[PDB]
């Protein structure tokens, strides 16, 4: 994990809730960290909210409705979902502790 306030992913996702159980779709949102580092049209003040299901959706799937859809640009296609999938990979993690 990055203990040094580098940051330098423009990207990160945060839980609308709690995470402790063993759901298997939860609800996360997309907090841009930095717009500069994207290319299209974002604000540094915006999080996008998408549920995600742990074992049915894919990141990169998911960040391919946030281009369609009018949220993020294709350019940062990979960014999104990797921000995505850092995410869930933590919170995969968490959960493999009893």
């Known amino acids: 994990g990055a203990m040094d ?8 996702v945060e839980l609308a809730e709690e995470d ?3 759901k298997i779709a939860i609800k996360l ?6 717009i500069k580092k994207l290319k299209g049209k974002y604000k540094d003040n ?3 909210e998408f549920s995600f ?4 959706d894919v990141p990169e799937d998911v960040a391919q409705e946030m281009v369609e ?4 640009c ?16 933590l919170i995969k993690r968490k959960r493999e502790q009893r």
């Open 74 to 89: 294709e350019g940062d296609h990979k960014t999104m979902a990797k921000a995505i999938k850092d995410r869930v990979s």
């Open 69 to 72: 859809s009018g949220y993020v």
């Open 53 to 56: 299901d742990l074992e049915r």
């Open 5 to 12: 306030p580098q940051e330098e992913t423009g990207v990160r």
């Open 29 to 34: 949102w997309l907090r841009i960290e930095d």
């Open 46 to 48: 915006e999080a996008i």
């Open 20 to 22: 402790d159980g063993e």
